[PDB]
Amino acid sequence: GALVDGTEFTFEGSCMFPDGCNAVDCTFCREFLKNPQCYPAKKWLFIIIVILLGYAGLMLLTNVLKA
């Protein structure tokens, strides 16, 4: 699981040199959380949105089920 991942075997081939290249896309579990971001209140504000809007969608479903 390296990037090049090139190695050697000694019985008769006598340690040749292969080349490889790998991206790192796999299961995303990690002990660290998220990543360092510039933020500076231009990015944090865009992250924060209306909360009652999410409550609005559930509210309409309650009206139809009883009706």
Partner: protein, 433 residues
């Protein structure tokens, strides 16, 4: 090397045989931690003088479980042949009472004494035919003399050793400071001391051990394959064991001529008749008689070494990505130096030491390290101190940046946080009272 320990150069005795390059002879003891498999460990040498120093690289390759050959024995393929010379009485004139003493090597009866193609086969008289049927007209019976051969027409030879144990050991390659490379296999689970050149390596940590029954190895000289068995062995051939003939010379392992190898009492099947004796045997082949399978803190002591003895620039070029991966990230540096030399640690790298070696040209030699953020400062590499600095964003095991799909699930999780407490606060007044 990631783990690196310097020597203890307090032992100082150097004779100034030459003024341009110094000389020194030293010894001691060292305690270096065991490196991960597939990587090499270092050992730094220091001298009171500044410019020159050397290194020593110890490379591990494998971890496995072998055991040491406490003994060694060869086994030929025995066969039983037997002859019979049948004198009759007054014509062989053999004694009325068969001589209880028997000469087991000469046999003067048939051509005096010579090389015997058997390994100490026995001797004897027998019962006697006498009369007109056997035809030599004497009434009294006739003694018969018999041989037994343990023989090997086209052998297939096995060498065996009863270690009867299993302890971890590894594969080591070694780098003398001069430039020699000598291989060997240290049994570093046991405080064995392998001898070579000036240095000797010894025990490590038995971080896991296991148990196993009385088994040991069987190998073939033509190298058919490798076999395993209960593999009993001692100075003698005990009853019912795998190895009966235990013989101690490969060049004499084709035939049976060396004395070292040892027979079994009454092993060969001689049986008599009214005229002459016939051959049989009770020996067992190695296979299918008792077979239970079929194969499909490293530290060193120092002797009396042979230790030997300007402008230089670092000029890094790039950075790779690893933090908190068991190998570390690999960094390349493009240097040049007017002399053949070795480098040393960067103080601010804050991760590990250095031990590079260069030729007199512009080359690059790349080494492995890991960090949260690149600093790369304060190295007393070569000749003079230089303070070079790098900068690059390192790669670590994280989540996936490719699609940012986890971002969508992050927004969904924070849903109706204040709503639950709002309904809880009104219910709390009712539930508490």
């Amino acid at each position: 090397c990631d783990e690196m320990v310097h020597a203890d150069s307090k032992l100082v005795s150097c004779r100034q045989g030459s003024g341009n390059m110094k000389e020194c002879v030293t010894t001691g003891r060292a305690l270096l931690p065991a490196v991960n498999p597939g990587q090499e460990a270092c050992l730094h040498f220091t001298a009171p003088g500044s410019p020159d120093s050397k290194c020593l690289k110890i490379k591990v390759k494998r971890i496995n479980l072998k055991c040491k050959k406490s003994s060694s024995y060869f086994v030929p393929d025995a066969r039983s042949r037997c002859t019979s010379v049948r004198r009759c009485r007054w014509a062989g004139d053999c004694q009325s009472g068969c001589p209880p003493h028997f000469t087991s090597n000469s046999f003067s009866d048939d051509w005096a004494g010579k090389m015997d193609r058997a390994g100490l086969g026995f001797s004897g008289c027998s019962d006697g035919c006498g009369g007109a049927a056997c035809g030599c007209f004497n009434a009294a019976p006739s003694c018969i003399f018999w041989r037994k051969w343990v023989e090997n027409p086209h052998g297939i030879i096995w060498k065996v050793s009863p270690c009867a144990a299993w302890v971890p050991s590894a594969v080591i390659e070694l780098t003398m400071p001069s430039g020699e490379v000598r291989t060997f296999h240290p049994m570093s689970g046991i405080p064995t001391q392998v001898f070579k050149g000036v240095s000797v390596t010894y025990l490590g940590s038995d971080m896991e051990v296991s148990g196993l029954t009385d088994l040991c190895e069987i190998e073939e000289l033509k190298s058919k394959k490798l076999a395993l068995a209960p593999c009993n062995q001692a100075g003698m051939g005990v009853v019912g064991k795998v190895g009966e003939i235990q013989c101690s010379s490969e060049e004499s392992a084709r035939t049976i001529k060396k004395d070292g190898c040892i027979w079994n009492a009454d092993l060969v099947g001689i049986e008599l008749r009214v005229d002459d004796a016939v051959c049989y045997s009770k020996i067992t082949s190695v296979e299918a008689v008792a077979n239970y399978s079929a194969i499909p803190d490293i530290t060193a002591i120092r002797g009396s070494f042979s230790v030997n003895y300007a402008t230089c620039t670092g000029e890094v070029t790039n950075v790779s990505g690893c933090y908190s991966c068991m190998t570390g990230a690999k960094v390349s540096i493009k240097l040049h130096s007017s002399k053949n030399s070795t480098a040393h640690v960067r103080c601010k790298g804050d991760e590990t030491a250095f031990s590079v070696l260069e030729g007199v040209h512009s080359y690059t030699v790349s080494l492995s390290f890991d960090h949260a953020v690149v600093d790369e400062q304060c190295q007393l590499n070569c000749g003079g101190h230089e303070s070079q600095v790098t900068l690059k964003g390192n790669l670590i095991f994280l989540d996936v940046p490719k699609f940012v799909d986890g971002s969508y699930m992050q927004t969904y999780h924070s849903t109706v946080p204040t709503g639950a407490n709002i309904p809880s606060p009104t219910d709390w007044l009712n539930a508490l009272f």
